Structure formats: C-alpha cells, structure tokens
Symmetry: D2
Subunit: 366 residues, 4 copies
C-alpha cells in the first residue's frame, strides 16, 4: 500500500484527495494509505485531514515530505512553491505528483528535471485533460490509422475567469511572481494534448495581447503584465502544420479546450465542455456519409473501471483518478507515466517559446 | 459517531455506492463514514472487493452485514427480487437504508416495505440518481422561481439499447414473476422520479407497450420474454397539466438518453442526461437576440461547488451518487428530509405499475 | 407547350408558390411554366403582385382565373375556408390543382372534394412541403432499403410559439366554426404527412388536447379560444407498430420544430426541421467507432443536385416548394405520381379530426 | 424600367445567378429583370439552358452578351482565367458587372480591372455569397450596436474536402498560371470577405501553407499540384486587434465549413455556414441563467422577411444570391452602395495574395 502525503487542501488538493481515495475502488489492488495532509493555517490542515481521511494534518509541509510512512507526494500548492516542494520531496526519496506548472521559469524546471533523474523516483505533471477516455481513445484511433496521416492540428483553450475588468490586480498578473498569463493557466494544457496527438513542436510564430491592462489595486490601478490571450502557428517535428490559441478573457467559455486533428483518411474533433463526445469522420458511402458522435463508454480506455454501461458521463474529477492510477502503476514499474519532469520541461520550453515569439515578433525554433 | 456502512452487492450500483460512501466526507466535509461490511457472493469476491473498496471485511452472508453492530446504514444494490427481503431485514435490525430502485417487483411488496419503514423509525432513500445532477436541481429551482411561468406540458423519454441485440440471452429478470416490469422497471421508474419532481404527482396515465424481442437464447434453446421492451404513456398531473412519457431498452444508438422538456407560459426548459452538464432555458427576449440559452453546469447550480469551484468542469454520473449519499447522511443526522423515502417511493411504484396495467387492458388508470 | 399557371392568393404561401413556379424549370430543366393569371383582393394588390411575381395579368375575380383557357394548373393559397369552393371550381374547369393544406375545415367537405377529384381525372397535390426536403426523402429511402431494419417505434412533434403570448389578440381562426382545428390543423396535419410517409397508415389514436390561454383581447374586452393550443396522441399503425405524436402553437422558443424519429430493429433515424439539412442515422458498428452519424444534406439525397452540385450548401424551406412544383409537373406529364392527392389527403384529414374527437371524448378512435 | 440581364457561364455559380435573377423581384418587389442573353460553350448547351433558365436567347459568343443594347448588367461566372477580359469588355460597353470571385488570378489583373471600374461610372459587385446570410448581416449589426463591446479576437476557418481524394485527377486549376491560388483562392477569399466585414481592414498577415497531395493522375501519368491544399495565418487588423485564419480543400468530413467567431470585451458571436440559420451570442448574464443564446434565423434578421414571414423556416444557400442580386439592383438604381465593388474587391485580392507571399517568404506582409 502506497503511503501518501498531500500538500495543499485547495480545490486541486481536494481533487487529488478524491482521486487517492477511490483509485483502488476503481482499478483494484490495495487502497493507498492517506498518511499526512499539509496546509495553513494549522487548524485548517487538521479540519480537512479529518474529512479527507488523512491519518494526521500538519502546517509543516517539509515534515510531511520527509515522513518515512510516505512514498509519494501530491503537490497542489501555489505555482511559486512548486520547484521548492518538488525538489525537497525528490531529495527525501519520494515520488512526485506535481500540479502544473513545474515552475514559473524554464531555468527552475530544468533544475527540477536534473533533480528528478538524479533521484530515480517517479514524477508526473497534473495534465488531467490527457486522462479522459475520449482523449485516450483519440490517441489509440490515430495509432491504428483511423484518420491516416495527420496533416493539420487546430486547438484552442478559451475560458472567461479574467473577462470581468473589475476583478482585482494580483501578484499572479506580474511576470516575476506569476510568470505566464493565459499561456501558463491554459496554454500548457493545450500543449500537453497537442504534442500527445501530433508529436513534438519544431517551431512557433506567436502573437499575444493584454486586453485588460489595468485592474483595481488598493484604492487605485495596478498594471497587468502578462497576456490575456495568445495565438500561434505551429510546425511539428513531423513537418505537419498547427494552429494554437488560449484566452482567459473569452466571454461565455468556462473550460473550452477544443482540438481537431485533420488526417489524410479522416478527422477527429473534441471539446472538453462536452468531454463525453469524440467526433470521428472517415470516408463512407455517399448515402450515409458523415461525422460519427462517439459517446464515451467502456470501449474507451479507463471508463470500464468507473461504469460498465456507456453514456453514463465520465467527469473532470475522474480524470484525476486515472492520473493517480497511472502514477501507482509507474511506481510499481507496471507502466511508464506521462509526462515526467523530462517530458514536462519540453512543454515548459514550448509555452515560454510562444511568449518569446509574441514579445520579439520572430519565430522560435526548438 | 462516524456513520457505519454496510454494502450489499458490488455490480453497477454496488461499486457506485462504494465510490459515493468513500468520498462523501471529502466532498461535503464532516466525518468520513466507516466502511464496515461488504456482502457479495462468492466469499472470495466479497473478500477481494472488500480489500480494494476499503471495507473492514467482506462476507458471503448479507444477513451478517445487515446485523453487524458497527453498521448504522445499509446500501442494497442486489437484484430487484431480493430488495423487499433485504430492506425489511435491515429496518428490523434498526438500520437506515439506501435501496437501489426499484422498491420491489410488485406494489404489494412496496406496500409492505412502506409500512415497515414507517414502523422502524429509520431513514430510507431510493437510489433515483438522475434527480441529483446540478442541472436537474437547477431546473426544479428555476420552475419554482417562475423562470418558465406556468408549466403547460411535459415531454419525457428514457431510451437505452442494452437489450437491442436479439442474441442477448434470456434471464429470470425477463419473466413477470421473477423479473417484474421490463423497460418500465429499469428505465420508466427513473423517468417518473424526474417527472413528478418537475410536474408534481400523476393523476392519470393511458399507456401502450410492446415486447419487440419475444424469445431469446436460453442454454442452446429459447425462452419467452414476458415483460415490455418499450412503453409510451399520456399523462395528466394532479395540476391538470398534460404530459408525454416513454422508455425503451431497444432504442438503438442511445446509451443513457433520459431526456425531458417542461414547456411553460413564460419559457421552456430542456435536458438530455447524455449531455448531463447542459440545461436549455428559453425565455422571451427582444427579437434581435431571442433564443434558447445553453446553461453550462457550474458552481451556480446545487451540489456542483462541493466537487469543483469553476464552471464547465463536467460533473460526472458517479458524482450524482456522492450527492445522494450526502442527502441520506444529512437526513440520518436529522438535518433535512431525503427524497424519495419508502412513502414517496411507493407512489412511483404505483405510477409505473399503473402504466403496465393500462398497456395490458387498453384502459386509462387513475391515482 | 409550357404548363399554364394560375395562382390564387398573394400572401406568404402564395409568394412561396410563385417563387417555386418561377425556378422549377431553372432547377429541373424542361419549359418554364407560363405565369398567366394571379388572383387576390383588392384588385390593386393583385395587379401590383402580378407585375413583381412575373404573372401576365392580375384580377380580383379568381373564378375568371381558374376558367382561363390559357390555364392548365391552379395554385390555391387562400384562407382555409375557401379551399373546398376554389378546388371544386378548378376541377370543374378541368384544371389540375396544387392545394395548400387543409383540403377543408370538415372531413365531410374533404370527402366531397375527394369524389370531385376522382370525377375530374385531373392531378391533385396537397402542399405538405415538409415531405420534400432532401433529408426527409433520404430517410424514406433508407427505411425502404432496410438501413434501420423494421420500424418498432415512431416519436414525432411539431412545436411553434406563434400563439404563446397571452397578449396576442383573438381572431376567427380560434373559433371551431370559422377556424376549425387549432394546433392539430396548423401543425398536426404536417406531422401526419411526415409520420404516415415513414410508418404507413394510422390504424388507431388515443389523444389529449388543451387550450392553455382560454381568452384573448378583443375590442377592449375578451373572447373565448375554442380550439386546442396543443395536443398529444399515442398511435398504433396498420403495421401494428407504436407511435408518439404531438403538436403545439404555444411551445415557447420553438419556431418550426417539426422533429421526428423512427426507431428500428437495426438502427435509428432522427430529424429536426429547424436544422432541415441534418439527418441523424444510427446503425450498429464496432465499439471503438460506434455512434450516430450526422448526414449533412448534399447531392446524394433526392432533389438536392437540381439546386447545387456541392454538399453542405444548405437547402432552404422555399426550395421544398420548388421540389413540390416539379413533382406535380411530372405527374401532370404522366412520368411520376404526386403525393398526396385528394384521396391520400382525405386520410390525413380523417386522422387529425379523429385525434380531435379522441381528445373530446376521452376514448380511442379506430380508422380501419 | 426592367433591368436587362446577360449571364456568362451556367455551372455552379452560373445557375445560382440564374435562380437569383429569376426571383429577385418576386422576393423584393419592383419589375422582374429581363433575362436577355445566356452565353456558354458549346452553342447547343447555351441554347437548352437559355430555354430552361428563361433567357430570351443563348449564344457561344460571350461578346454578344456584353454588347447587346437590351443588356444593362452582366453576371460573369466562368473560369476565373477570362474574368479580366470579360469584365473589362462589359465595362467598356457601358454595362454594370456582377463578377463571381475571384476578380482575376493575379493582383496585377485585379488592379487593371479596378482602374477600368473607376473610369466606367457603372456599378460593380464581387459575388461573396457568405456575406448575404440573414445570420451574418445580423452579426454585423449586433457588433455595430455594441452588443459584444469592443472586438478583441477573430478566429475563422473555411474547411472543405472536395480535393481530399488523392485519385482526383490533375487540372489547369492546380497550376499557378492557369489556376492562381489554391485553397486561399477558392475558400480564403470568402473567409476574408466575412472577416474584414466583421473586424474592419487587415494591417498584417503571417501565414504558412501546405500541399498535402503534391501530384495527381494526368492522363496515364501524373502532374504536380502547384498551389496550396491548406493555409493558416495570424492577423493584425488596422484596429490593432488579433485574428486566426485558415482554409483547406482537403479537410475530410467538411463540405461548407466557413466558421467564424468574434470575441469582444462584452460578449462573443459564433457562426458555422453548415448551420447557416444559427448565430450564437454570449453576453454577460445572471449566474443562474448565464450562457450562449441560439438565435434561429427569422424575420428580425436582414433580408429574411423578403423570403418568409415566420422564423425558423431555414433560409437556403441559394437565397443568399437573391439578396446579392437585390443589393446590385438597388445600387444600379442609386438607392444604396453594393459591397464589395472592384475597389473593395482589390483589397481582398491583396490580402489573400499577401498570405500566399508570407507563406513562401516566411516574412509577415503589411498592408497600408
């Protein structure tokens, strides 16, 4: 049984806790031990340790990470503490489940990448949009030649959580203390899906905008420093073309990570807002020719562990149960987990390259 | 003082209950219920699934699970024919009961169970999980608020195709004595649970039904399918309002198509369980922008905020059961009545059995 | 020689017929029909629209129009109450008839028209324009070809909201006498035209109906609504197969929601007139790719190629009327049968009236 | 007095023009345009199609069509290769011109034509079908009225699969000199016409392009495909706002997928030509009912009421061309400007050719 430490009792902390709790229920084997939950205030850590089912709560995350009854650490804390907590956990010989991003800077992620190899411990980044049965069925369909050779990718990730210009300035809207804007909150997720479908990125040319440049701060204005939206043309290492965008100011969209792979022999199309539908076109006889709506069910990877009957919608939170399982099996040496800190660094370099391209108005190569 | 849980059955709904009991405190807070006894056959299955499900022990004897002193509440997810025996035993042993639909094979059995529950002074709830989505709960609140004005029509359907394949073999569940109702039993009861929650009680039904596949493979030979594959009904509610109702286990291409519509004097609400994160609301607006709204499930809808803070992160089927578990938990702690209990549930048994009666005799049935 | 054309009525269905008659030869080839005479009131209105519609002359006397020697076929698009009289005069004058629904307000009147049509030996067609879409005609062929095996269930609706607003004034159309049927007459008849084309003849209906807004503004007072705002019915087809059926003129947010589905032993077809270019077809497939296909209307579907060689160029409501014109054109030339004639039409009148009776009596109505 | 019409070409867009001219007065009133001369090759084909289209006569002499004294306006819909010669001849003969896109294969030819137009004092319009839908015109007005605040991003695509089959034979249309641009010429121009109508003029493009099927069957052997199967571009508008843009003639499963989206400070508009009767509008609302609206095309949208009084009766692809004809008719009568004329059209040609140049040079192209 895996000894589990969880750091952060925020919403992604709770998402991790719910996944650890049901991973053996879904996939079988021994339920992981929920050893130690870490957060502040210490009254906090204790309240949620009780309801989350952890043996003890602690306000000392460094103590949590070095606990000898612990094997794997989930890190769900704010972005700026990711490097520190991850390297500390690897230093203590713990496996790491790290919420995106690895770090704010490529330089930090690179150190994390070197530290992870050196530790000989499993790592995985919380790119949970790669865990849906629909997405995994799409990768398998492409691998079976369902759409022949991929000739074009078009992806987007629209949300509107920053659209309201009255929302207050925060240190997260600063380059230093936040890093990337929309490319950091959303771009990285779209890249995680995109490279999984099309293989590695060779080149980007990007544009970006700050749409709301000043926000309420104390009694006055403070300046927004990172992008609200960005778009890029992609060239994949394969030679294939791509279109890419993200926005945190796209009004009416809440989780619109939408992508499409056009192939020589078909097209796959998906929208996370309807995560139980995969659209597949393959040439058919004229009388019946058209896109198929594939409704998520037990024919798709992971679904059978949650429900034996198709069309019982798989949820966002169950993505995280699959991610937990993938890490469990990797820790037991029964399957590689993706992405580790090495694959993760590559994603960090692509979104930073996109930011660099938009700033310089020049293409960036990888 | 944590809730002590017994689970009977580990199938579709068995595992669904197990996942709900496991994370109910994670989602809603308070003390995690203790997973005490898992009952299933054979003994080896009960033991392995007790291990992976996190139950303190497994047993092949459901009566052991129900009578265990550490157990306060019993999830019953066994075949419909054992529901009455198991539920009445649970109540007799002083336990709260989470009973999968349906209450039993017959209104008579359901009548006996309803008396037992009233006499037991324990909390009961039937597992009508399609009443637990944020979208459904939002629709109930919108109607109450006057969002579509006076309801004037209901149109509901529940299509699935799990029996469309004629080679799918015979089973005792396809007989009337051992299986009870067909599509009315498996699907109809879910649509009634949604329909009466939207429109209030049924006053009258006129129904028609069909068995499309009358004979199925039975161990090299063939055996007769006695219950209906599909049924349709015209409804009058106690309100006087009209309704259309149907269910089918042979509707090809549909996997969980519980779809309904309430038309009102000031708007329309529409929903399809296959897109359980979307609620369609039409209200009159200026001609230039007049049209239905697509309400994407988010924290504004009941229950959602307990699972995710940001809209458009699709709520799942299984999360419906975590809400249901929480509703029973709160009823047990005397902090709010759970719906439906055995009293509310017996009314739903009368409606689907009245529909079957109406289809057989070709006459309307009144309540 | 080109088909000589008379059109009666210059309202919206009148305009729809004129547009059909003008482009039917453009779409399907042969000789453009001769636009001879257009009839309506007042005579200034008729002379005005004759010019813009491309008709050689206008007249306020429609009897003139139907008796004109240069006329072979008469489009009747006038209000429901004049249909019997105008169709009978056209048949008496030895003219073919293109008649907007209904045949008449009563079954009795439709019966007389049906006998007159058999006596005249001229071709007739009723304007059931929702049976002319490429998508609907493709669905009929797929069923006949065995694409969804044997039909086991039909579910059809026709929701619109043109009477949903309680502010909307009273009119003689909301009387049983002068208006006839309500939602069953405006919308039900269309759903029946589509339903019987998919499932064959109706054997039996059990129906319910409601007037939801019972009174409407009238001369600073109110007046009673006599006919139904909505109706639903369970169906048994002559085949033995089951059906669900509804119509509503008070269904808020719906504009032209004639939507139907045929569930079969081997698949499912589903259609919504508000997206008239999409036909949804399910057939069992291998698990990894199993699901409904979205068939987008294109040249593989009946009639589409006469309008456009490339798929996905949306076919329009008005183009249904061009197809209807061509069907009557070919029937008049004896190269094809136009559906429905006054005989097939009468059956449709009997079904909607039978539904109204069932709703009134609370008892089923048999047709066979 | 009735407009005298000549039509050159009878293919896809030829017949579309024919159907538009035939019914424009039926829809919008006034005098039916006189269909005087149809021109196409061979003569027997021009003769049969003139008969069925209702043109007074047919000819294989296209110069007869532009020179006939009874002709006021010339629809030109033939291969793009002779657009300049034919358009310039029609202008020199004192006729108005309805020119099917593109203006010509080259910016140079288009530039000469734009000069010829300015000197001619006659009205011109380039056929841009997709700017005439009720939904699109409704979207432009909603943007002008502030319905989505200030536009902050445009994302547009035009996917079709008519060249996806690699066995489709080589043609002169796949050569640079006889075909000009590939997907950018066939689909890009259409997307630009919609894009600049929503966002105002283009300031800058950075583009990339691909030939997916580089060689095709040529009478036993094979010949090289010289123009692009697909292209994408990032846009800066004159306003400074950003854009995404793509087109493809090899995008499998798409038949007319001209889809666009304008995200604004106060809302979002989204449209797909394959469902040309739907416009999606998001504006901030109450959390309990917050979401996108499905606006079904009806009489509240520009042009619809000319074809049908009742909403939800789907407007067709072909009715866009009836609207285009009416716009040219009104402009010729001095009662309104038609967009785009040869001057506005030249800009559109510069943008698509700029995208092709950008893809080839790997540099951005700016426009003044």
């Amino acid at each position: 049984a895996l000894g589990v430490a969880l750091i952060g009792t925020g919403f992604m902390g709770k998402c991790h806790a719910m996944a650890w709790r049901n991973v053996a229920t879904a996939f079988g084997g021994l339920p992981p031990r929920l050893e130690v939950l870490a957060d502040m205030p210490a009254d906090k850590a204790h309240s949620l340790a009780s309801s989350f089912g952890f043996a003890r709560g602690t306000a000392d995350w460094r103590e949590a990470v070095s606990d000898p009854a612990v094997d794997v650490v989930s890190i769900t804390t704010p972005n700026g503490l990711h490097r520190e907590m991850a390297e500390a956990a690897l230093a203590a010989g713990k496996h790491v489940w790290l919420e995106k991003p690895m770090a704010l800077s490529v330089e930090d992620a690179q150190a994390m990448e070197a530290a992870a190899r050196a530790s000989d411990r499993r790592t995985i980044i919380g790119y949970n949009y790669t865990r849906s049965p629909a997405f995994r069925a799409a990768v398998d369909l492409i691998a079976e030649g369902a759409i022949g050779r991929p000739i074009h990718f078009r992806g987007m990730y629209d949300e509107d959580y920053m659209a309201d210009p009255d929302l207050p300035w925060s240190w997260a809207l600063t380059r230093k203390d936040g890093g990337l804007g929309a490319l950091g909150d959303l771009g990285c997720h779209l890249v995680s899906v995109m490279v999984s479908l099309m293989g590695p990125v060779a080149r980007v040319y990007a544009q970006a905008d700050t749409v709301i440049t000043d926000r309420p701060h104390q009694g006055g204005t403070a300046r927004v420093e990172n992008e609200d939206q960005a778009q890029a043309l992609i060239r994949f290492a394969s030679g294939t073309s791509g279109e890419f965008s993200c926005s945190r100011v796209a009004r009416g969209y809440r989780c619109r990570l939408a992508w499409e792979v056009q192939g020589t022999e078909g097209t796959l199309r998906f929208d996370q807002e309807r995560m139980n539908e995969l659209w597949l076109y393959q040439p058919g006889r004229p009388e019946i020719d058209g896109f198929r709506r594939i409704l998520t069910g037990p024919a798709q990877p992971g679904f059978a562990a949650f429900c034996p009957g198709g069309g019982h919608n798989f949820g966002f939170n169950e993505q995280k149960v699959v991610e937990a399982e993938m890490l469990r099996q990797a820790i037991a040496g029964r399957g590689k987990a993706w992405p580790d800190f090495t694959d993760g660094l590559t994603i960090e370099r692509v979104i930073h390259g996109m930011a660099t391209s938009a700033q310089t108005g020049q293409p960036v190569n990888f």
